[PDB]
DNA sequence: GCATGCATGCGCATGCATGCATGCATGCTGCATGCATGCATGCGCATGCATGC
Ligand SMILES: Nc1ncnc2c1ncn2[C@@H]1O[C@H](COP(=O)(O)OP(=O)(O)O)[C@@H](O)[C@H]1O
């Protein structure tokens with residue numbers, strides 16, 4: 294504890310053009326991969342992207358890696 | 371001075387601008403029906419955690 298790892302993650306997420314900062318249990322399930330929603334404007338079925346889909350061609354920053362679910366860890370794998 | 375015809379009012383008859391109610395029918399309109407739609411609900415099942423042993 295207290296060696297400034299999280300500050301480094303915050304900094305590296307501020308320097309990258311595309312980069313997302315997420316914490317262990319606050320981003321679980323469809324908040325990582327994708328979700329099914331209906332588009333209000335075009336009346337079509339879309340897929341909403343999660344953190345991993347927002348950081349495509351970028352850097353993803355995950356904090357408290359040891360606390361995540363097994364399902365979330367499979368996706369990272 | 372007498373005889374005459376015209377213009378002046380009476381004394382009929384008819385038409386005519388105003389005005390208002392009634393029965394029938396027009397013309398709209400408020401009501402009842404049917405339906406599409408999208409959000410919420412009440413539910414049973416699968417996963418991840420906490421509490422023993
Ligand atoms: N080497 C360091 N240099 C500067 N600040 C540090 C250093 N180590 C820790 N800190 C400070 O101490 C705190 C550590 O918080 P954090 O980044 O969450 O540490 P950790 O990731 O280990 O939990 C922050 O305020 C950070 O600025």
Ligand SMILES: [Mg+2]
Nearest residue numbers: 298299356357
């Ligand atoms: Mg930390």
